[PDB]
Amino acid sequence: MIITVTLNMEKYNFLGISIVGQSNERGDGGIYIGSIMKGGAVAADGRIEPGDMLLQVNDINFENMSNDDAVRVLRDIVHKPGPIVLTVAKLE
């Protein structure tokens, strides 16, 4: 199941997630939601859970990217004006 969420940044301010992991060199796996902080935009939306794989934010793809780089990119994205649209693969 893939779910794409448009976050309400105007109301909730900050993403409020932690992320764990990264894709292997072959391209399997990716970056997962480790935790979701109460009071942030991701918590507000309600549909994303811990263990979901973070696939894309706006036009930026999170497979085949280091966790270091992902943390940096997520900061950069949230600081830019405009919508934040997050797509995840749901953990079974």
UniProtKB/Swiss-Prot annotation:
Disulfide bonds: none
Annotated PDZ domain residues: 4-76
Subcellular location: Cytoplasm; Cytoplasmic vesicle; Cell projection, Cilium; Nucleus
Tissue: Expressed equally in both animal-vegetal and dorsal-ventral directions of the early blastula. Becomes enriched on the dorsal side of the embryo after cortical rotation. Expressed along the anterior margin of eye field of neurulae (stage 16 embryos) and in the anterolateral crescent that borders the eye field. Continues to be expressed in the optic cup at stage 26. Expressed in the central nervous system throughout the early tailbud stage including the entire hindbrain.
Domain of life from the UniProt record: Eukaryota
Subunit structure: Can form homomultimers. Interacts with prickle1. Interacts (via PDZ domain) with ccdc88c/dal and dact1-B/dpr. Interacts (via DIX domain) with ARP/Axin-related protein and dact1-A/frodo. Interacts with sdc4, possibly via fz7. Interacts directly (via DEP domain) with efnb1/ephrin-B1 and indirectly with the phosphorylated ephrin receptors ephb1 and ephb2, via association with SH domain-containing adapters. May interact with lrrc6. Interacts with custos (via NLS1 and NLS2); the interaction is negatively regulated by Wnt stimulation.
Primary role: Involved in at least 2 independent signaling cascades, controlling cell fate via canonical Wnt signaling and cell polarity via a planar cell polarity (PCP) cascade. Acts synergistically with dal/dapple-like to activate Wnt signaling, stabilizing ctnnb1/beta-catenin and leading to dorsal axis formation. Also prevents degradation of ctnnb1/beta-catenin by displacing gsk3 from a complex with ARP/Axin-related protein.
Family, as annotated: Belongs to the DSH family.
Name the record gives this protein: Segment polarity protein dishevelled homolog DVL-2
Lineage: Eukaryota, Metazoa, Chordata, Craniata, Vertebrata
Region of the whole protein represented: 252 to 340 of 736
